[PDB]
Design a binder for this molecule. Structure first.
Ligand SMILES: Nc1ncnc2c1ncn2[C@@H]1O[C@H](COP(=O)(O)OC(=O)[C@@H](N)Cc2ccc(O)cc2)[C@@H](O)[C@H]1O
Length: 482
């Protein structure tokens, strides 16, 4: 039963055309309108040469336009590549060249964001009268499940980011499994929180839209204070929150310090992205109790958003009084989450080892990084038709069957929720004329360096240098010398 993510969306549109698909502070779209507008744009893209396996850059901001754009690119048969407008010009230009993007779906306010850009550009804000002249009908057969849906960049330890290539089939599998796992229904209202730079945005978007619920797009201003976040969520009657762990940590502190009530519509809170602090888990249970439901979700971008989950509100008191909160069990039967030793053998329960993913969840690979792909995406020695992804994460299965996350073997970390390779930062500082050798460590980032020639504005200088190359969260707050 072959399916693309947009076909899944198209089935829902057919079921509930008049339901509200997407709401922002500025306007809303029904399923039918979202669909017809995405089709107009997709037909336009097809006339720009977009077809299966074509990478299309997306540099939009969180808005109805953004959702139209993503869906249109998928319907046209292309794969989208998020280009985060907050990244420096040099980084975005690099990704555009690396990926060979020749179509860019953007907005006039982000013009001049790519250096030397020679391809086709569509500005959704200024060119909508033209896109309105294209067909409103669903496109047929533009893609197969093994075709790409998105290529998303993540931090690279050798000094540049690399694209993780996700096929429709893994994404459709994730989406189907997640809807059933979360029990999403046509009554739910999901807050879209994270930038499309994080694969978690796809969770929020496609889980919502392919189940018939209402996607509610946040503003920048609503997250800067927890009370505003909660109150706005209450005004919106939000039923599902999807939160980066570091943000939920903040939220828990604030809930209790203050005497803030959760929205009465909220039924489910999904968290992930890093190790949840058992103490804050205990504090959530003491002050909030078992409703809303709280779920800890785990996985790398390379396993299509998530591969496991643990329902924290279903844990016993003593399962929660441990020092590690579990990441749980596989999202589904066709996804394997192994703890293996160094010869790729499974180990007895409660023995630590490295986490490997198998089955439907796997990315195709890294884009234009054959050596890195071969090293991470390994042929399964005991199942030769299949691959395993080496997560770099240490874990162990408990006797009760739940997986525990035990840390990293390497120097990847999370800074303010964002995936960071410390070697990326290290590798980039080296390129500067007055840096001879360098080491960056957490925690949160502190840089350690031996200059060629010191001078007393080296902190502000090296930060200026990094500001034009790396995202701001990769910029160490402090530096150290000797
Ligand atoms: N829950 C949990 N605990 C401990 N460590 C976690 C974790 N989730 C993810 N990690 C760590 O982050 C790495 C993967 O980083 P990523 O490729 O940036 O992607 C993600 O974190 C998300 N794809 C996970 C996720 C899914 C769904 C959801 O609602 C929120 C988050 C892992 O290798 C691990 O180190």
């Amino acid at each position: 039963f072959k399916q693309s993510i947009h076909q899944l969306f198209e089935t829902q549109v057919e079921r509930t055309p008049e339901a509200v698909a997407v709401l922002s502070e500025q306007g809303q779209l029904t399923y039918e309108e979202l669909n017809t507008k995405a089709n107009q744009l997709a037909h336009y893209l097809r006339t720009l040469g977009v077809k299966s396996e074509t990478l299309v850059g997306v540099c939009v901001d969180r808005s109805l336009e953004m959702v139209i754009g993503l869906l249109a690119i998928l319907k046209a048969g292309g794969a989208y590549v998020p280009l985060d407008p907050t990244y420096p010009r040099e980084r975005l230009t690099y990704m555009v060249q690396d990926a060979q993007i020749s179509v860019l779906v953007t907005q006039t306010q982000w013009s001049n964001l790519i250096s030397d850009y020679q391809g086709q550009v569509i500005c959704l804000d200024s060119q909508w009268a033209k896109i309105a002249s294209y067909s409103q009908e669903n496109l047929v057969n533009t893609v197969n499940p093994e075709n790409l849906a998105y290529v998303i960049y993540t931090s690279g330890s050798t000094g540049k980011p690399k694209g993780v290539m996700i096929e429709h089939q893994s994404l459709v599998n994730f989406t189907k499994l997640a809807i059933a796992q979360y029990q999403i229904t046509t009554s739910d209202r999901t807050l879209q929180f994270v930038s499309i730079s994080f694969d978690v945005a796809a969770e929020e978007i496609y889980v919502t839209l392919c189940s018939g619920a209402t996607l509610i797009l946040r503003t920048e201003e609503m997250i800067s204070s927890i009370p505003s976040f909660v109150q706005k969520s209450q005004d919106w009657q939000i039923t599902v929150w999807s939160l980066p762990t570091a943000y939920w940590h903040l939220l828990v502190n604030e809930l209790v310090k203050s005497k803030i009530a959760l929205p009465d519509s909220l039924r489910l809170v999904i968290i992930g992205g890093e190790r949840v602090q058992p103490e804050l888990v205990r504090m959530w249970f003491k002050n909030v109790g078992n409703f809303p439901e709280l779920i800890n979700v785990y996985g790398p971008t390379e396993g299509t958003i998530a591969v496991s989950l643990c329902r924290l509100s279903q844990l016993t008191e003593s399962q929660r009084n441990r020092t590690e909160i579990p990441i749980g069990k596989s999202l589904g039967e066709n996804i394997s989450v192994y703890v293996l030793d160094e010869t790729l053998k499974t180990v007895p329960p409660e023995t630590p080892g490295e986490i490997y993913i198998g089955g439907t969840a796997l990315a195709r690979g890294y884009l234009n990084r054959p050596e890195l792909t071969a090293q991470k995406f390994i042929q399964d020695p005991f199942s030769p038709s299949e691959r395993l992804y080496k997560t770099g994460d240490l874990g162990r299965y408990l006797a009760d069957g739940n997986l525990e996350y035990l840390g990293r073997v390497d120097h990847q970390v999370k800074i303010n929720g964002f995936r960071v390779e410390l070697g990326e930062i290290e590798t980039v500082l080296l390129q500067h004329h007055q840096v001879a050798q360098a080491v960056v460590i957490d925690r949160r980032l502190v840089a350690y360096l031996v200059p060629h020639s010191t001078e007393e504005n080296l902190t502000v200088t090296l930060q200026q240098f990094l500001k034009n190359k790396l995202p701001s969260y990769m910029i160490p707050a402090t530096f150290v010398v000797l």
